[PDB]
């Protein structure tokens, strides 16, 4: 039983590097975090900040979520992130991805007690 918070960390946290490594980053990262295993997850974002910094976003700027819920929060500071976007030549189980580095405000949905990130909603 993977908690929703643990799943968020597996899907979206990569504190080890400061920015996307190579053009290869998403191909390898989407694979190893088990985001390509039943299918190719079409789009995914990895956040290169400490877990404490990302968790803290749950007390930052409250904003509407894409699905209409009210539990989303935008970071006051920009954060180092990497966007992974499936290519057209990508066919499961050969998921291939374009790797885009950026520094952007992240928007996460938070839930629970303790109140922690459980969904990555957007970057702006
Ligand atoms: N405000 C919110 N609070 C809590 N959870 C919220 C939420 N908004 C959406 N979800 C949750 O995000 C997923 C939406 O699918 P999506 O972003 O459009 O991506 P998806 O097609 O990839 O479906 P998943 O693979 O389940 O994406 P994930 O939920 O696993 O990963 P993610 O939540 O960071 O996108 C569902 O589990 C939904 O309850």
From Swiss-Prot:
It catalyses: an [RNA] containing cytidine + H2O = an [RNA]-3'-cytidine-3'-phosphate + a 5'-hydroxy-ribonucleotide-3'-[RNA]; an [RNA] containing uridine + H2O = an [RNA]-3'-uridine-3'-phosphate + a 5'-hydroxy-ribonucleotide-3'-[RNA]. The active site is at 12 (proton acceptor), 119 (proton donor). It is an enzyme of class 4 (lyase). The keyword Electron transport does not apply. It is found in: Secreted. GO terms for cellular component: extracellular region. Keywords: Disulfide bond, Endonuclease, Glycation, Glycoprotein, Hydrolase, Lyase, Nuclease, Secreted, Signal. Glycans are attached at residues 1, 7, 34, 37, 41. Pancreas. GO terms for molecular function: lyase activity; nucleic acid binding; ribonuclease A activity; RNA nuclease activity. Substrate binds at residues 7, 10, 41-45, 66, 85. Disulfide bonds join 26-84, 40-95, 58-110, 65-72. The keyword NADP does not apply. Its EC number is 4.6.1.18. GO terms for biological process: defense response to Gram-positive bacterium. Belongs to the pancreatic ribonuclease family. Interacts with and forms tight 1:1 complexes with RNH1. Dimerization of two such complexes may occur. Interaction with RNH1 inhibits this protein. Monomer. Endonuclease that catalyzes the cleavage of RNA on the 3' side of pyrimidine nucleotides. Acts on single-stranded and double-stranded RNA. This is Ribonuclease pancreatic. It comes from Bos taurus.
């Amino acid at each position: 039983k993977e908690t929703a918070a643990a799943k968020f960390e597996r899907q979206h946290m990569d504190s080890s590097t400061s920015a996307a490594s190579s053009s290869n980053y998403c191909n390898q990262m989407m694979k190893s975090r088990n985001l390509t295993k039943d299918r190719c997850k079409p789009v995914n974002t990895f956040v290169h900040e400490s877990l404490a910094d990302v968790q803290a976003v749950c007390s930052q700027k409250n904003v509407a979520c894409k699905n209409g819920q009210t539990n989303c929060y935008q970071s006051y500071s920009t954060m180092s992130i990497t966007d992974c976007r499936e290519t057209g030549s990508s066919k499961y189980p050969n998921c291939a991805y374009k790797t885009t580095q950026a520094n952007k405000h992240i928007i996460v949905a938070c839930e629970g007690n303790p109140y922690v990130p459980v969904h990555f909603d957007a970057s702006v």
